[PDB]
Amino acid sequence: LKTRTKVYYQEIQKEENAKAKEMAQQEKLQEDRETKERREKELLLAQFRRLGGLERMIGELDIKFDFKF
Amino acid sequence: DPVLAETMKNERVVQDHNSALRGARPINFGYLIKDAELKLVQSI
Amino acid sequence: ANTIKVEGYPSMEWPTSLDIPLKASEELVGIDLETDLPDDPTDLKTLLVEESSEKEHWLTIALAYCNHGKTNEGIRLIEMALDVFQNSERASLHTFLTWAHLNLAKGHSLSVETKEHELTQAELNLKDAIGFDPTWIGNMLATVELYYQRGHYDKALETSDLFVKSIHAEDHRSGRQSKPNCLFLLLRAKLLYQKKNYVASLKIFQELLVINPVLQPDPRIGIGLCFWQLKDPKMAIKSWQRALQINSKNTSASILVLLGEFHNSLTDSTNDEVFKETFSKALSDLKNIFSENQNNPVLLTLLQTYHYFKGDFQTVLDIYHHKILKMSPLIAKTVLSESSFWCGRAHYALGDYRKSFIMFQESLKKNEDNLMARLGLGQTQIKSNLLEESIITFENLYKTNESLQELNYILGLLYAGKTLDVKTSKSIPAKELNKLNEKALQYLERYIKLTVAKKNQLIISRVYLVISQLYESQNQYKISLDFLSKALEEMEFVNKDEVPLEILNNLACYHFINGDLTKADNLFEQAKAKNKSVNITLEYNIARTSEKTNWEKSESIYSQITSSHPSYISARIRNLYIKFAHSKINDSEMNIEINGLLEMNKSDLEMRSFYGWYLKNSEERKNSEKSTSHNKETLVKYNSHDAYALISLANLYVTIARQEKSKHSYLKAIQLYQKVLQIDPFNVFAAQGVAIIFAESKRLGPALEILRKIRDSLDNEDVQLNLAHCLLEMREFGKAIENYELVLKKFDNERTRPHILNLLGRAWYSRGMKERSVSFFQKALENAKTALELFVQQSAKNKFIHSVKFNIALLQFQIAEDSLEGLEEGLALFKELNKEELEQRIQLGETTMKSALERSLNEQEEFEKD
Amino acid sequence: APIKYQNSLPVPQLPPKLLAYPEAPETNPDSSQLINSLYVKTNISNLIQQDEDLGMPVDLMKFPGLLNKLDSKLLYGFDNVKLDKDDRILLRDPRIDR
């Protein structure tokens, strides 16, 4: 079973898994911090993300279709 | 007075007059029945 | 560009030019497959029959035909070679025809009859080809693919595994190495995806990338499918984006990228500005991709969602009944389920709950795991007065979706609304009621937990209102007030002006209950700022909130509530009281009015209470005849165990008890005290009457304890005066006196200052009489002076004037032990008080005292001289 | 002064009245806004599968030499392909941000 295809797939799999896991670990601690959390409080006050906001926002959209149904 | 009837139907009662009695804090007083009955039946 | 093209990768591109030899060696007739293909295959059929052309040229030209969008023409062309090539030469022709008919049965721009016809022609040519060459891999792959296209998935997997086994065996027998067949791997991965074995299918779809990154069907579509089903939308969208980047003419990749765009617009957006343009780009791409795929059920369902969120419910119904319903047997069950779900949503928004029920039921029939369809079904059951049925639906959904926030919210609101219902309180025992309250709190608090854990989501402000109601029903005012405040904050932390009138009003009522009325009036006025009923209600609330400050602001609002709505009992009670206790009334016009109000609402209880308080507390009716008659009437031939009137009867009966029938009356009062203490232990006044009975009959040990405890709740002048009474009886003065100044600084009661000063004379009696004290006696005398003054000034001519005067006389006598001047005033007042032996003693004692005090004063002056 | 205990009942204290809350149909359990809040989270997933073919139709008409020259060589792929980084990240395992 030791083909270049299987071994190549498995080692690329290993490398990408290691890269992605290490990236996930270093994300919250160090990458994006220093009061960017409070800009994600802007995300808290989002209209489309709270009750009734999805319709309202979608109602504001200019684009619309020419129906045939 | 129909508007007054609407007022009444839209009104709750936070404290009826028995609830009004107890005061600012609640003391247990659950022993008071036992002790009072005992001490005043000793005088009986 | 219908073929994958990447720099560096292989290419599975067809020969673009085929040249045919002429019969007998002028071997160059060029046929350019893009351009020189006649629209009539017979034109090349003549050329192919003339030159004794090979069988593969026929097949090559027909494949070039089919790969240019003319599958019917190429089918005809090979069908023209079937009666030319004969007997086992036509095997590969039947293989080609099988695969071409398979390709014709692929699309929703088709019919059930057309699909069945093409599938049947495919398997017919397949039987023909198996008759000749049953081991050629084209026919074996066509077998497995036919099984797949007929829905027989595990049968197809069985036959595919058997074919792979046979091929491995044949190669191992002849010594050659078996390379993986990409088509068998693809079929197996698709079948495993159908089996919901997403990890194995993912592994196969990923290995196909290494074996061939140009494989058309792009495995990346499958690896993205498996990534999605394994809860990794990021890599799924990434793989579909890659598949579209590699072949921009792949429509499945474009539709998957479109779905991913909608998903990312809904999740990754951090504000409405970003969302309104990401979703708009998604909608524009939807329009463009739809303009040439107008029979696509996914695009039609997307249009349905958009038109639902746009309020265009009729277009949703039209898309369902005019497009999806006609091609219903040809589309996958999940897409059908979602489109039916959106039709049901449209019905639900139009108020048609029967049709919405039917549509959500159909959607569940096509996909039982349609979570939002089941939620819509539960909500339809709610709307159709099927409450318990809806609760069963939701609680069955709860076994798998335990951390679903909206589901916890729904079940909590349902259970709470069931708890706050009077019918259920009448129908089931109390313990079940409290278990129901506890379950509602369980659901709502778990919802709050789940929503706060994901610190990005906003709390539905109502859950706090419902929790506060649940705690309010159980007389736990503290937690209810805290949750009402927590609702006010979050309520005002979004839309700062639209808080409902009732939140500020009820918060003000709670602030009135506990603590002073400074913030209560503020909130009441803030509610007044923002309905005819609310006006009367909060006007009574403001008038009731001022009775301690601007009493006369209360009087006016009470009048105009009674000047325009003369049936509000609370307004009239409090108005007569407030202006009565503010002295804008005489005792007669009280009675009249009060009697008018008394037997107006005669039968029931609140008014009666005020009535009792009138008679007993202040003016004319202290006579107990009416009291006995009416405070008994509150309980005659009713079952009412109510505390106020019966406690009044008990304690004012023990006032009469104050002598064998005296024993009788005392034990009657004790009985009633116990009886009212049974229903409500916190009844402070029953325990206070028991402390009275304990203190009165010389058992002033536990009575002082009970009073000390009572003061931890009650803070009136009455109970604290009772406290200081028992301390003077029981023991020495500071415990007695220490509480009398505290009485005076409790309330500005001008009648109890009279009540205080005589027993203050007693309090300074007891310890200046413990031993001669000349510095304490004089302040004793000062208090007694203020006593007599307060008793002469008022319209109170009780025994108090007489007794107050004497106590002062005795104080003067004992202080003479400006000494002679107080002595002379003592002589004067004691002569004014002129029993017999006492006044003859007064004569001899004047003769003694005036002279002897002059002697003491002259001796003092002589020794001050030196 | 004599001693005389008085259990002076309070004035019939009827405190301010409470007000019941009006309709809030957006927040009732029968509200479609709950389903929309859920849609924001799990929106288009029941659609990623387009047909039973999973968006991957098997053609055999895309392998040159197969259906015409009976040469089934391209069904077994290619040798020593060095995938681009975009294709190589796709080879990793799911849910690896944990």
Numbering used by the authors:
A (entry chain R): 502 to 570
B (entry chain A): 164 to 207
C (entry chain C): 2 to 531, 536 to 663, 674 to 832, 849 to 865, 875 to 906
D (entry chain P): 9 to 106
Show me the paper's own sentences about this structure.
In simple eukaryotes such as budding yeast, PAF1C contains five subunits: Paf1, Ctr9, Cdc73, Leo1 and Rtf1. PAF1C can regulate transcription through direct association with the polymerase or by impacting the chromatin structure epigenetically.
Cdc73 and Rtf1 contact mainly the outer surface of Ctr9. Cdc73 without the α1 helix still formed a complex with the Ctr9-Paf1-Rtf1 ternary complex, while Cdc73 without α2 could no longer join the ternary complex, indicating that the hydrophobic contacts by the C-terminal α2 are critical for Cdc73 to associate with Ctr9. Rtf1 contacts Ctr9 spanning a region including the lower part of the N-terminal turn and the upper part of the middle turn of Ctr9. As Rtf1 and Cdc73 occupy different regions of Ctr9, they do not have direct interactions within this core structure. Residues 531 to 552 of Rtf1 form the bottom of the letter “U” that lie in the groove of Ctr9.
